[PDB]
């Protein structure tokens with residue numbers, strides 16, 4: 437696999453950068469439990485995604501929302517996300533995603549879990565922005581999702 441491996445150079449055009457940080461912060465700011473609520477949706481649409489987290493597999497949304505493991509996974513998504521959104525520096529991505537990638541591959545979380553995540557956050561963004569989710573917003577975000585997508589999973593040993 438791993439065509440072109442790691443390179444990336446100057447990733448997104450500045451206008452895409454301006455709009456992906458602004459919107460991530462709009463959402464983070466205005467919707468307090470945003471990231472957990474994204475996970476609580478993924479599990480509705482894809483019940484096996486619940487199963488990759490063995491212990492909580494089989495719980496209802498209300499006792500899903502108060503799980504030490506759910507909350508801790510969610511703020512960890514939250515911090516990797518805010519770390520990148522700070523500068524959208526394409527190549528501090530390699531060390532950021534490095535352990536994530538290994539533990540995800542160990543619990544068999546892959547490509548259709550990342551895809552799903554992207555769909556559900558895309559949705560959240562649109563519920564937030566309204567009619568002013570005018571397509572630069574969608575493109576910049578997909579491009580961001582591609583930069584990130586490009587260098588994910590396994591070389592786990």
Ligand code: HEM
Nearest residue numbers: 485488489509512513516535536539540543545549550553
């Ligand atoms: C952009 C999305 C995501 C990010 C950045 C992310 C990040 C992380 C992080 C920080 C870890 C732990 C790494 C460590 O211990 O050093 C982790 C673990 C885990 N995550 Fe994710 N996650 C994401 C998406 C998902 C999705 C969508 C699933 C499953 C449908 C998932 C399932 C798990 C599982 C099962 C663990 C368990 C603990 C472990 O073995 O480390 N994650 N994730």
